[PDB]
Design brief:
Organism (chains A, B, C, D): Mycobacterium tuberculosis (strain ATCC 25618 / H37Rv)
Oligomer: part of a larger assembly
Strand content of chain A: 25-35%
Main location (chains A, B, C, D): secreted
CATH architecture of the largest domain in chain A: 3-Layer(aba) Sandwich
GO molecular function, one term (chains A, B, C, D): aminoglycoside N-acetyltransferase activity
Number of helices of chain A: 11
EC number (chains A, B, C, D): 2.3.1.-
Keywords (chains A, B, C, D): Acyltransferase, Antibiotic resistance, Host cytoplasmic vesicle, Secreted, Transferase
Largest interface: A-B, 53 and 53 residues
Bound molecules: ligand UTD, chloride ion
Strand order of the largest sheet of chain A: 1-2-3-4-5-14-6
């Protein structure tokens, strides 16, 4: 049977969690994340022990046009290894989606453990994780790079500058598509992870600028690699200044960061090739819950002239879509469809990370008009490049 | 001293080549590539032995709008290890650029051995190489993917279907920015490399469709890896059909290809994550020789409304640039600059591989108007994604 | 500005330390090492936070002839990654050298994080670290090797035999060039490191002989490798007996030790090749602060007949150097130089680790007389091979 | 039975060779090396097939004092895997040593396949192979390094400059202890190996100076490693000039060379640590056949004053040894021994690669007088550092 969990169910859920997630944050930390789950935000399957669970958290997601949407963040999704191929995932996703839609969320979001699961439930990959590794021994800043003229950056202990990190992040998340509000409990969690653990991670340090910060630590095993866990810069000056400081970590051979495809770091160096892409993966996945609410909520490129089309989402409705002056109107119609796509495809287009033209070339997006394709491409494009905030 | 080489100089140039290039194609093959070098296309430095050399080949490069430009392809550039830090590279590049400009080439192009060299001579990286590795054991085609309904693809010996490869490639290179005309000597060279070599590469096979081909071989050392040397598809149907056949290589674990960032392959699969980005690097580099000729020659996005600005290229002139109805007019002016950039930056923008906004964020492109930045971004964008033809 | 640190500065110095040194011993241990730093032995740069620091400790260094010199041991040298290329290192080294020279130290010493830094400040590499790895499964002792006839060696817990280790080390450090006095705080530190740490190093064991000891532990990750942290032997009998016991660690495949190039271990085995050199690096670096005081203080080889020359140290003075009966007299002169060298070169010659002839072949040491070169080589040679005591 | 081989035996010897030596040069090349084997220079054991073989070649070895000794070079030593532990090696070594001693050779020499075999037959390791790997991307020459002011070095094809290589090598081998005369057949062999082989080694190049040459090739598998097979420099200027050219191989990450422990290369660089010791091994092994002839033939250090002692070689005679003015007189005596050592130990001392003091510390060399030890150390030391010529 499928139920909202009682307080009695949570020890059983933590057991399933520990057995399902190698990166399980543990019961103390999980209890803190729990404060972000609304009443009726969780489902469990009992056989009595917990053999399936899924929940969503109340999130705030920034989309193009600096618009902030209420977002259901799916998380803590697990089926017991004893109960595979019994349709438990489908049943739990159907119930949560029912609750999320009824609660009035226009979008749901998740981070996927595997890439093959969530497409069939209407989730499309919406942000791209891009790992850059810099061999900092060869790194020289271009003549054009800002801040090559005191340093504005300070090396600090993260726990002593929480207020400054919170304020910089709050500015960042409001101006960048993919930005998430980071509540106080997640700041508590982040700064507890900044601590060195015996047999675990090394101490984290911060580089602090008025308009940016970098959190980094030396890798556990590779003592010549510094991993930047987080760099939030609100200005180009802040971004360059922080990278000048990171390239100044003279005891390291390599600096690595999980960033976005449009990170300007390579262009700050005389040799763009030194900032090597070592890893690429889907970041945030989006399911558009309400097509017209979602399409009307975001801003569109002003550079494209007013145009009208008919969009059909497979079992998601058909809409007269009019885009002009950076705004969309999206109304019901029975007029012939000019564009067809599955719900997951719309999620992938929504933050501007994937081009309509690319999805059309894979036949994930069907139209008979190449002009309409170019107009969609241009309109859905994001002025500010889409980034990934934090994993949940 | 710096001279055009005589026939007597070429053995000395082949020695320097063998000592400079681990992938040196050898004197027979080098003599065939020589047929693409015009009279006065080569310079040598003698100390008497050859201690420096550089040449350019007559190429035809496709740019956005399906426009074909005469292009000087720099190649075979080497300074003897005995004559480093003597300004030989600067002297040879200055002389060839003089000859290329005087001959009336609007653009020069090269493939860079290192990323830190050619920026200072006005070359910007203009295409992006993107290696995808597919674990084909898990690869399943999406319900939406074309051609899941006889097969239109044939497994053939490359040497027996030269005419068909030539015709498909000729269609491809004319419609794709980054496309190069492949002369008969380079078809001779390609199909000679398709042969198995004792102690060297394994036999190459071809997958042939009416509207595409793939050339592939099993890796020398990794016998569970097939490397696609070349996939040219003129239709989405051809692209999907060829990938269905490659995923059908049941004796392989992995298929790898050097492609472009907008390759739709990931979107053909139920799990987009199976097409892993394993390597990323600059491909073709461009030096704009004549700013107004180059800017007027290419097509621009129709989606952006007519706009005017003043572009200054650092020691490259200042121009009144008017872009409307997908065309540019670029005339001399002494009016105040609204946009400033080095010549290399313009090369990087020219085929639409890099966004003005990204280069602006690194301060490689200076303007005080963010609206102008969005308009440049939109205008210079390529409808057909930029690809890399063949290395030279 | 550049100041001696107050008690308030030390938390800021520990932050810079933690961020600069992956092997940072932590504030408790650093506070113990602090007891070896004299009043005015430390400098800091403030921007207010600590952005640069450097100090020296009062050490006692054994040089050829069993002569013990007061030595300034430079340590804890760091510039913040935010303040690179601002001349902070040069400023801090200039001030400490001023204080060290004025305090009457004839020599300064350090261990170098990188090999390219300290040459320009007059430091030359003076000892050579030589890692030997023995595949002990094949190791058989030569018929000639001592102690192949009860065992004189005991397997003990290090913490229970501190008095015996202290007494053996005190005998060792007084008879070996490179020997350092090990104060009580460093014995406290060493025997605390002998403990097993959860997620860290395994338990240390000791092999104890009347005239030697070995400290060893099994490697964290490679459980078939025993690492000898320290072997101090005052007699050849002790050295051989300890190696017989180490080769008796039948659960190990390999024994590794960081020793000196003249370690006789290879010659104790029937197969000298079993003691493989797996790593070689500069150990102790010396800056001669007072040329005449340093040259007069050490003993010279008795085998070379009395000779006189004129030595010029680049911006270090010119001296009439007379060496006879194992003693040097070194007096000011304006007579023509017969030998010229930078100060760093003299440091490299001083403990007999590097031959004048080898440095002459690199033109680091200039003379027009090859007989003088042979005489310098012979005179500066050390009867007892130079070893490295402990890192600081 | 044990016989000198007939012409009929050599096919059987080549079979045993092919099965015994993974680096077997093949019958053509082996037939060329054969020209260096004197009449009665070879023994075979037949069971009829060849189950054991050993031979010596007529060599000329340079020893300290630029003295050239006739030397029996043992080579091509093999016992069939079917005939191990049957005393065939002992029987063949006894017969060849009988023939070598009777023929009037003062010394025999070999390169050892394993380090544990040849000690018991009186061979001691006499030279040390020292592999240096330079990360040439970081390598900068010291201000003091010669030739930092045209280049005197030429990049050439080895086969076109045989005369120049022969003349430089002939100068080198006469002035360096360990030097071997390289006959014309071995020059034929060397320049045939300079060729690229299909599925094998890449093409060899030469760097040619009036007073030195380097032979190098790119590694088969590691295409960023250049291996210097041979560098012969007669002057410090030649040595530095050749290394400036090798560091100029800008397509390589690393240059490796098998050199000697006193190679001045590290001291030519601003960072001595960049020239990393990656491998160390015994090179040439010596068996002193006639103790008095060998000890009287070499020159001794002039810096040590005249001294007399009594040397006993274990089953090798007892001698009154008087060393003065760089010469030794070595006459029979029954006077009490002051120094005792096995024959192999004398071989190890003979070229100055190993110190008497080091061998004494392993009890391989016994005396009750530490003054005598220092005098032996000083006297047997080589002014010109011992190098290894070519493997045989
Ligand atoms: O466990 C979670 C959230 C997952 C946290 N992840 C983010 C940081 C990651 C890194 C490493 C992985 C884990 C959770 C637990 C209980 C809840 F009620 C709601 C949510
Ligand atoms: O050598 C070249 C062209 C370089 C060919 N490259 C393309 C294919 C590559 C792959 C592998 C690397 C080499 C050449 C030689 C002589 C000329 F006159 C003009 C040009
Ligand atoms: O931190 C040091 C000394 C460095 C200790 N090193 C020796 C042992 C090493 C091994 C591992 C590395 C660290 C220090 C700290 C504070 C001082 F006042 C004076 C000195
Ligand atoms: O085979 C040899 C000599 C060994 C040659 N070695 C030198 C170069 C080496 C390198 C690789 C290994 C082989 C031989 C053969 C027949 C003879 F009569 C006398 C001698
Ligand atoms: Cl991101
Ligand atoms: Cl491509
Ligand atoms: Cl040591
Ligand atoms: Cl050598």
């Amino acid at each position: 049977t499928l139920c909202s969990p009682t307080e009695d169910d949570w020890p059983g859920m933590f057991l399933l969690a520990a057995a399902s997630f190698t990166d399980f944050i543990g019961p103390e930390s999980a209890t803190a994340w729990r404060t972000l789950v609304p009443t009726d935000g969780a489902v469990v399957v009992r056989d009595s022990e917990v053999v399936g669970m899924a929940l969503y958290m109340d999130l705030r997601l920034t989309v193009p046009g600096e618009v902030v949407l209420p977002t259901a963040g799916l998380s803590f999704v697990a089926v017991a290894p004893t109960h595979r191929r019994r349709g438990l995932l489908r049943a739990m996703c159907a119930e949560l989606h029912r609750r999320i839609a009824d609660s009035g969320y226009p979008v749901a979001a998740l981070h996927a453990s595997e890439g093959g699961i969530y497409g069939r439930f209407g989730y499309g990959p919406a942000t791209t994780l891009h790992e850059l590794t810099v061999d900092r021994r060869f790194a020289r800043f271009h003549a054009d790079a800002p801040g090559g003229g005191g340093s504005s950056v300070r090396l600090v202990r993260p726990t002593e500058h929480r207020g400054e990190f919170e304020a910089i992040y709050e500015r960042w998340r409001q101006q960048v598509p993919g930005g998430l509000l980071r509540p106080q409990v997640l700041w508590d969690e982040l700064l507890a992870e900044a601590k060195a653990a015996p047999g675990g991670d090394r101490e984290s340090f911060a580089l602090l600028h008025p308009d940016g910060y970098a959190l980094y630590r030396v890798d556990r095993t590779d003592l010549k690699l510094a991993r930047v866990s987080e760099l939030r810069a609100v200005t180009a000056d802040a971004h360059c200044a922080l990278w000048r400081a990171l390239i100044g970590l003279d005891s390291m051979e390599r600096i690595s960061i999980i960033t976005h495809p449009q990170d300007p770091l390579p262009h700050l160096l005389t040799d763009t090739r030194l900032a090597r892409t070592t890893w690429r993966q889907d970041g945030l996945w989006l399911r558009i819950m309400n097509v017209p609410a979602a399409l009307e909520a975001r801003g569109y490129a002003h550079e494209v002239g007013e145009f009208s089309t008919v969009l059909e989402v497979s079992d998601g409705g058909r809409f007269a879509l009019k885009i002009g002056d950076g705004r969309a109107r999206c109304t019901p119609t029975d007029a012939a469809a000019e564009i067809e796509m599955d719900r997951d495809v719309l999620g992938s287009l929504y933050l501007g990370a994937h081009r309509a033209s690319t999805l059309a070339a894979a036949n994930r997006l069907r139209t008979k008009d190449s002009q309409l394709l170019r107009r969609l491409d241009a309109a859905f494009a994001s002025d500010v490049p889409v980034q990934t905030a934090f994993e949940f």
